[PDB]
Design a protein. Structure first.
Ligand SMILES: [Zn+2]
Length: 218
């Protein structure tokens, strides 16, 4: 497998030592009000040498329409079979429209906009920006605001065979340069996808489809 950029999906290029770094900027909601971040739940496991990788409807409260959700529920796997559990458990992913400010490993990406996926560690980092400590001179930040945001420094290094994001961190506040220019603003926005698209009926609402599939995989 390889290159994702061409399809509008950016991924941090890691080097030989599994390390990597960049400066990206999380963009606000394309559309009115809110939701600059998409939250999608799935299940992704291999068993018997087969793979089950599908979206989950728990993503909008509907746990019943998901075979794997029912399985974990009926069998209390969390408790009765914790090994099956961690394998089978639902996975949460977050997506954003981002502006690559600096990408040393691939400079042609800078200034371009892509959709970016991530997990709890970077999500937490985004949330702790609003939950600050006043006694340390901290003030809350909407890192997605084009005028009050803060670029993010994405830094990776392998620990225990796992990418560790501990060096990642938000910089001071600032405005996206040129943001107030209509040509620029509109070219940036032309590059932003509708994140709600990812959370519409992309779920095989045919739990039955999902079930025969879960079936031959199990
Ligand atoms: Zn599920």
């Amino acid at each position: 497998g390889f290159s994702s950029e061409d399809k509008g999906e950016w991924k941090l290029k890691l080097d030989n030592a599994g390390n990597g770094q960049a400066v990206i900027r999380f963009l606000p909601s394309k559309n009115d009000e809110q939701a600059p971040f998409a939250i999608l739940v799935n299940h992704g496991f291999k068993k018997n040498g087969k793979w089950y990788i599908e979206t989950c409807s728990s993503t909008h409260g509907d746990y019943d329409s998901c075979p794997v959700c029912q399985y974990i529920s009926k069998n209390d796997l969390y408790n009765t079979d914790n090994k099956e559990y961690s394998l089978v458990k639902r996975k949460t992913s977050y997506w954003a429209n981002i502006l690559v400010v600096k990408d040393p490993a691939a400079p042609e990406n800078e200034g371009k906009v892509f959709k970016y996926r991530f997990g709890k560690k970077i999500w937490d980092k985004i949330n702790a920006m609003i939950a600050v400590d006043v006694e340390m001179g901290e003030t809350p930040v909407d890192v997605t605001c084009p005028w009050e945001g803060a670029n993010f420094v994405l830094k990776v290094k392998q620990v225990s065979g796992f990418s560790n994001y501990d060096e990642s961190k938000f910089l001071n506040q600032s405005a996206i340069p040129n943001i107030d220019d209509e040509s620029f603003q509109k070219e940036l926005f032309e590059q932003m996808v509708d994140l709600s698209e990812m959370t519409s009926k992309d779920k095989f609402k045919s739990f039955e489809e999902l079930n025969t599939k879960f079936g031959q995989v199990m």
